[PDB]
Design a protein around this ligand. Structure first.
Ligand code: NV1
Ligand code: NV1
Ligand code: CL
Ligand code: CL
Ligand code: MG
Ligand code: MG
Ligand code: MG
Ligand code: MG
Ligand code: MG
Ligand code: MG
Lengths: 9, 230, 230, 9
């Protein structure tokens, strides 16, 4: 499964 | 720590250089040093902290999975288990380090929704990484620590952030992955991803082109998971 | 060393596991431990040693080049120089470690052409990596150490190995890169690559299909360089 | 410039 990028605006 | 003698601004500058050089262990040590100066982190600095440790633990997770797979095949000398244990212990040490930074004292000083949700999501994430390798007496307690952190973050994000907020979206994405991969709750995972996606879709019309690009990038990850899961 | 208590065979087994896991720092530490047992290395073990350290130093070289480029632009605070120096010092330490293993006592115990040429090539390679970052009082002496090691390896390889031997070819390839990139001798580089390629081409007819595949792979690298250089 | 692979037969 895909999880979130580290960098989030 | 070995970074105690370096200026905060220099540590941040060197974290950015390390990122450019793809030196993520260095990047993490620099950002740990910056956190330990005791001042709150800006949005950009929180992202640097997350990028650094996500890349470090990501290499350890990939290695652990390779070795675990070899080990499970061997069970269809002690060296495979020993080396898997070595990587596992190093991974656990990185997760413990991040969780320690969040507990001393990033979370308690984070009053704004963006910072508090970002850090609580991180706490869920690194308990989730611990859960991936856990196997006895404490796997259940690690899972519930991840769940508790994600849940507090979700509650704040739903009250304080719009449905397209990238932090809120990335949180919901990772909590849905927690449900599917860790908590044996694929239906909860699917429901959360669906509701999150649809509520974000209905709020896109409020966004600038640049915000729309940020939000839709994470929405596509939700969709990719739903496609994998259904 | 920290590997002194582990069996030689276990160190080799774990080096292979580390390679599968893309844990090249671990792989290098395991192979350093194996070397330090004091027994000569087999062909497969020499290749493991080389793979491990080539990957470690390769990451450091890529990082050093990123940082050096940033530093040179900044010269068209001290942090960029400091961090470039940090990576540079770590790189030099890895090269010194490899050179120390070759000197104590891999080279002196290597009597067969394949082992002796492999190790002398490695000695040239890691002096070449030192040369890439050297800048004063010792750059010339480092360059001549690389040249001397490569030259001894070349002399043995031409007397004792066929022109298609992959060790001989990889040696000639790297010595030609030394000439072009380090010694400011592009014509020597081109001449060596051309003669090496043509002499190997004329010997391919003696090879099995599998040997032909090994040799032609390195010949293509010689050709790629000639295409870049002319 | 391309240099040699680490593993050589
Ligand atoms: C807005 C959006 C969010 C998540 C995924 C996608 C592909 C989209 N788009 C759609 O039109 C989905 N109906 C755009 C980008 C074309
Ligand atoms: C044998 C060889 C060595 C180095 C590069 C190449 C492309 C080749 N070949 C040639 O025929 C070159 N004339 C084969 C593989 C087709
Ligand atoms: Cl181990
Ligand atoms: Cl530094
Ligand atoms: Mg200060
Ligand atoms: Mg364990
Ligand atoms: Mg159902
Ligand atoms: Mg023994
Ligand atoms: Mg220096
Ligand atoms: Mg000319």
């Amino acid at each position: 499964s895909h999880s979130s990028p580290a960098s989030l605006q | 720590g070995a970074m105690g003698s370096m200026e905060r601004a220099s540590l941040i500058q060197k974290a950015k250089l390390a990122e450019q050089a793809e030196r993520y262990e260095d990047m993490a040590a620099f950002m740990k040093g910056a956190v330990e100066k005791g001042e709150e982190l800006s949005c950009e600095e929180r992202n640097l902290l997350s990028v650094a440790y996500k890349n470090v633990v990501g290499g350890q997770r990939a290695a652990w999975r390779v070795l675990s797979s070899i080990e499970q095949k061997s069970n269809e000398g002690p060296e495979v288990r020993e080396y898997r244990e070595k990587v596992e212990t190093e991974l656990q040490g990185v997760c413990d380090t991040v969780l320690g930074l969040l507990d001393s004292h990033l979370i308690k000083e984070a009053g704004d929704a963006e910072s508090r949700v970002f850090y609580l999501k991180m706490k869920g994430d690194y308990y989730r990484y611990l859960a991936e390798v856990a196997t006895g007496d404490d796997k259940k307690r690690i899972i519930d620590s991840a769940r508790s952190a994600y849940q507090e973050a979700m509650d704040i994000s739903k009250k304080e952030m719009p449905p397209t907020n990238p932090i809120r979206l990335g949180l919901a994405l990772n909590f849905s992955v927690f449900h599917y991969e860790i908590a044996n709750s694929p239906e909860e995972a699917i429901s959360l991803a669906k509701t999150t996606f649809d509520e974000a879709m209905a709020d896109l019309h409020t966004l600038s082109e640049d915000s729309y690009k940020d939000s839709t990038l994470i929405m596509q990850l939700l969709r990719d998971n739903l496609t994998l899961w259904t």
